Design a protein around this ligand. Structure first.
Ligand SMILES: Nc1ncnc2c1ncn2[C@@H]1O[C@H](COP(=O)(O)OP(=O)(O)OP(=O)(O)O)[C@@H](O)[C@H]1O
Ligand SMILES: [Mg+2]
Ligand SMILES: [Mg+2]
Lengths: 19, 338
């Protein structure tokens, strides 16, 4: 599922302008 | 007041403030520093207490050297300049700015309900009426900004704060710029970065309406429409244009999003002849009393818990870092006009 895909992306926490 | 009258009047106030900025000076030793509220790529924002008045504020602290290394000199000058000149119900207000040998400080109104982000992640997702409530404010806010030829360029839940009445306050004007024609800086949090920006084209105010599309999607879906492991892969997806929606999205929501998340500028809502009115009149905003939202007469879908003036229980905890000030001036030239 997309929701599962999101979790495994590693980008569910706070996003800064630069990574 | 019609909108034309309101905005033309707004443009006149702004230009005055723009041309003769007020003396919003203060000094670091005038504020008691309580706790870190949040951090970004550039700055740390701290809850502070004015030693005199007892008033609380959010102080944004920027390291001059870091600002220079990350090449945000012109952006930081923009940030402060635009902030002290704008005036809208949902833009956080700048109370003081100043600098010392080492740092730049922007002391804002303290918005104590935390980031939209933390509520969104915890609840999981917002119902469409709930998302619609926040979306309407952003719409009115972009209308105001764009009439001033200002573009915001970093719309995300991390940059939106909830106040005591459950309304949005847009903060972080780090990428805000006055642009009457085109601009070229490759900037903007990746998930929310418009295609034209990624393609290294000259772009305009329309990038914010793309970003609105991404916001609304994330608010109703609980996750953004374009994501992947590395920022590179994300950009590929944004350029591809192919969006897939969750099955619970209403048909209206899907249509609006199709018109916001439009890779072709000639078709993107908010960039057509009718302008912002194509968004304000879209089926999904049928039940939106656009005026009443501006006057803040509409009941918010929720209101955060409050336990005092300097209560920070709606913000995550961050590791506290020492505020260092050099004994000699640094970057005197780069920030001469701050
Ligand atoms: N007026 C405010 N009141 C309360 N908290 C705030 C306020 N302004 C900012 N914050 C908190 O501090 C965090 C960092 O602020 P800001 O986004 O201005 O820093 P930044 O370095 O520009 O971030 P970015 O990486 O998005 O550019 C915000 O995400 C928010 O959590
Ligand atoms: Mg930010
Ligand atoms: Mg920023």
């Amino acid at each position: 599922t997309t929701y599962a895909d999101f979790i495994a992306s590693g980008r569910t926490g706070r996003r800064n302008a630069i990574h | 007041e019609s909108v034309k009258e309101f905005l033309a009047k707004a443009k006149e106030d702004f230009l005055k403030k723009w041309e003769s900025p007020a003396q919003n000076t203060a000094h670091l030793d005038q504020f008691e520093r309580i706790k870190t509220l949040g951090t970004g790529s550039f700055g740390r924002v701290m809850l502070v207490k004015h030693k005199e008045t007892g008033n609380h504020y959010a102080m944004k602290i920027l390291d001059k050297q870091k600002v220079v290394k990350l090449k945000q000199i012109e952006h930081t000058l923009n940030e402060k300049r635009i902030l002290q000149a704008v005036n809208f119900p949902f833009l956080v207000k700048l109370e003081f700015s100043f600098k010392d040998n080492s740092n730049l400080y922007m002391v804002m109104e303290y918005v104590p309900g935390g980031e939209m982000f933390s509520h969104l992640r915890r609840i999981g997702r917002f119902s469409e009426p709930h998302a619609r409530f926040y979306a309407a404010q952003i719409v009115l806010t972009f209308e105001y900004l764009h009439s001033l030829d200002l573009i915001y360029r970093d719309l995300k839940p991390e940059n939106l704060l909830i106040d005591q009445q459950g309304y949005i306050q847009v903060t972080d004007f780090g990428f805000a710029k006055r642009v009457k024609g085109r601009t070229w800086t490759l900037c903007g949090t990746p998930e929310y970065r418009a295609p034209e920006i990624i393609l290294s084209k000259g772009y305009n105010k329309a990038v914010d309406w793309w970003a609105l599309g991404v916001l609304i999607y994330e608010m109703a879906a609980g996750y953004p429409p374009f994501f992947a492991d590395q920022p590179i892969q994300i950009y590929e997806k944004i350029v591809s244009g192919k969006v897939r929606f969750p099955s619970h999205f209403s048909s209206d929501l899907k249509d609006l999003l199709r018109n916001l998340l439009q890779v072709d500028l000639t078709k993107r809502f908010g960039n057509l002849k009718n302008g912002v009115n194509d968004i304000k009149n879209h089926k999904w905003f049928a039940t939106t009393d656009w005026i009443a939202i501006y006057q803040r007469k509409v009941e918010a879908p929720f209101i955060p818990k409050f336990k005092g003036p300097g209560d920070t229980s709606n913000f995550d905890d961050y590791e506290e870092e020492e505020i260092r000030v050099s004994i000699n001036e640094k970057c005197g030239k780069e920030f001469s006009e701050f």
